Design a protein around this ligand. Sequence first.
Ligand SMILES: [Cl-]
Ligand SMILES: [Cl-]
Ligand SMILES: [Cl-]
Length: 163
Amino acid sequence: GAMAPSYRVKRMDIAKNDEECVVNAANPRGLPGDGVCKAVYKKWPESFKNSATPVGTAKTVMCGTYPVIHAVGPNFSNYTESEGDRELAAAYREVAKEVTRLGVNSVAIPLLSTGVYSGGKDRLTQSLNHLFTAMDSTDADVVIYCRDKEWEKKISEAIQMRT
Ligand SMILES: [Cl-]
Ligand SMILES: [Cl-]
Ligand SMILES: [Cl-]
């Protein structure tokens, strides 16, 4: 575990992370996709061998020795708000099980279901609060990746407000 487990946020491409493993915002079919998924496919294409997995689950595939945790959040265009909320919480719980199983001291993580799976809504708080619910009982250092300057500020505020 980390000596003093922490949360941090950085505004940059998760493909350039400085952590011991990465969480992909995957689709259920293991396809290259869009957004974070496409960046992950460019950097770690070997990790897409047999990565298909259902909504609400995570599946780890190694790229060399570097673990890629493919986490499938719901697409809110298809799910009801209630069922999508349940599956988004479930995907993060499965990320926490994998991070623990792998024994890593740090993990790079995007906010699941916030981009093209957001159903056109701002889901920063919903997705971040499910991340915290799952990861709070882990001892890995967690580094959240985002691309928007205003999101960086709001994620940073949410972290700092709990310390
Ligand atoms: Cl960048
Ligand atoms: Cl998304
Ligand atoms: Cl963002």
